[PDB]
Amino acid sequence: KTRLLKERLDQIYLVNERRCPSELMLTLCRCGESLQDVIDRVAFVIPPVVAAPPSLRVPRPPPLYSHRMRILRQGLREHAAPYFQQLRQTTAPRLLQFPELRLVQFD
């Protein structure tokens, strides 16, 4: 027979507990400016190496494990689709420096 009750907190309690602040402090570089302007000016460090994750290789993966990983990765990709570009933009590493263009004149 069907099972009933025994949800402890009830979401209506959480609705009842309702719980009902900003400034220009982000100007960390002086002379105004958005902080991304100064971040771009002094962000140059790259990893010496960088490497991909290790891969767990087996001759014959079980079905349940692969099914779980497929479900998990599909769900994560689909639900991060609204956030995806900004997400991978924030996370990606810096692997190339290139010379600065002013060095052409300076040299």
């Binding site: 602040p21 900003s22 400034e23 220009l24 402090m25 982000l26 100007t27 960390l28 991060a80 956030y83 900004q86 997400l87 924030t90």
Partner: protein
């Protein structure tokens, strides 16, 4: 009724207009010299000229030194911040000890932000474009104004807005019968809903048929909100924007406390000074009360040396009862009040005295009145004798059990027999300690 606490009977320092102390007023009795000094301290706080000046309340236990600090809070009112803390609270698992002190230093500094705005609102009725054909050239049809008519409760008025509003206007998806919100400086439209005139036995909408507003179509709103500097630090330290993935990532990982840097403090001081200069903000420096200050470590005191010398700092009130005691964090260094002499040179010391039997009796009567208890004269005298023998606080604690005992016996007042019975059902620390020799 509201619940009765230990210091609920205290309502102020009970001082004259001249600053002299009445023998009994505002729930306090005695400690006239200490209360006069606290009068000077509330004047110092109200002057708002000083930063970081510190006070120590020193004396034996039970001399009301905690009550005097709370009396200082009552005299200042709810405008001035008053931050209470215990010395044992600095020992956090998330942040260092000196950060806890600096958080509470900033919590004691207040700020009233008095931003103003002027707006227009009501039920839209027109959505009427004007027209002048051509923009002085090759042309289709040119509008040159947009007529927007609002009516809320008091009347109706037409506004000929800038044509540029039209993009924002269908961005908000407004139609006739809706009710909107437009700000004067920006001209930014916001849809609130649609009126209750299209409601009242219709229902079934998540937008809510928001009711037709009251008042004039054109309004000037003056919002005042009180906020501390610590609130500004906490708010500006975090990436609260929900449009970034790391913000909602913050939901799952724990949002622990963090050790806020001095750069953020400086920038917030800068923008607060700019607000003060431009007239949008008013500063309200307050009080930090550190009871049980002896629990602090030598590191905490040595940091307070610098913290009290700041020009930003609030007025600080310390309280201790220890004698010549070992400083925590040191191996064998004794000092008065469990506090180093170097910090003790930085404070003004307010002494509190032991009470006479008459003062104990008077305080007991005040507490009986506060707790809604009727006590006979002989019962009060016997309770004062008990307080003389053992302690004021112990004798004060016996009132409510004795009143309950009298109510159980059907009586409406405490007689001597009830306090006599309660004094044998319950024991004091000294009597119990003497009994500990008997029961080992």
């Amino acid at each position: 009724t509201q619940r009765i606490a230990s210091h609920s009977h205290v309502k102020g320092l009970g001082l004259d207009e001249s600053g002299l102390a009445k023998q009994a007023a505002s729930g306090l009795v005695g400690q006239e010299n200490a209360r006069e000094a606290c009068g000077v301290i509330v004047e110092l706080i109200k002057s708002k000229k000083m930063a970081g000046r510190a006070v120590l309340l020193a004396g034996p236990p039970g001399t009301g030194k905690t009550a005097l600090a709370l009396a200082i809070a009552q005299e200042l009112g709810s405008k001035v911040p008053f931050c209470p803390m215990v010395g044992s609270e600095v020992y956090s698992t998330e942040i260092k000890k000196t950060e806890v002190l600096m958080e509470n230093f900033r919590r004691a500094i207040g700020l009233r932000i008095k931003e103003t705005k002027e707006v227009y609102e009501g039920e839209v009725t027109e959505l009427t474009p004007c027209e002048t054909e051509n923009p002085m050239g090759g042309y289709g049809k040119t509008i040159s104004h947009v007529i927007i008519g609002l009516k809320t409760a008091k009347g109706t008025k037409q506004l000929k807005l800038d044509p540029s509003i039209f993009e924002s206007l269908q961005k908000e998806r407004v139609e006739a019968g809706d009710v909107i919100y437009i700000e004067a400086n920006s001209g930014a439209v916001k849809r609130q809903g649609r009126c209750d005139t299209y409601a009242t036995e219709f229902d079934l909408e998540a937008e809510e048929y928001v009711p037709l507003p009251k008042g004039d179509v054109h309004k000037k709103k003056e919002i005042i909100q009180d906020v501390t500097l610590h609130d500004l630090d906490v708010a500006n330290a975090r990436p609260q924007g929900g449009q970034d993935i790391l913000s909602m990532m913050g939901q799952l990982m724990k949002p622990k406390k963090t050790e806020i840097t001095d750069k953020l403090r400086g920038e917030i001081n800068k923008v607060v000074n700019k607000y003060i200069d431009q007239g949008i903000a008013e500063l309200v420096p307050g009080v930090l009360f550190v009871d049980e200050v002896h629990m602090l470590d030598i590191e905490c005191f040595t940091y307070l040396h610098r913290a009290l010398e700041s020009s930003i700092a609030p007025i600080v009130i310390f309280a201790s009862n220890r004698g010549n005691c070992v400083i925590r964090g040191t191996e064998d260094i004794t000092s008065p009040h469990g506090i180093p002499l170097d910090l003790l040179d930085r404070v003004m010391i307010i002494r509190t005295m032991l009470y006479t039997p008459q003062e104990m009796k008077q305080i007991i009567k005040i507490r009986a009145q506060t707790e809604g208890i009727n006590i006979s004269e002989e019962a009060l005298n016997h309770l004062g004798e008990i307080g003389t023998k053992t302690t004021l606080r112990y004798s004060v604690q016996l009132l409510t059990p004795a009143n309950l005992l009298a109510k159980i016996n059907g009586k409406d007042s405490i007689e001597k027999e009830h306090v006599e019975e309660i004094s044998e059902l319950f024991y004091d620390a000294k009597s119990s300690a003497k009994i500990l020799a008997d029961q080992q």
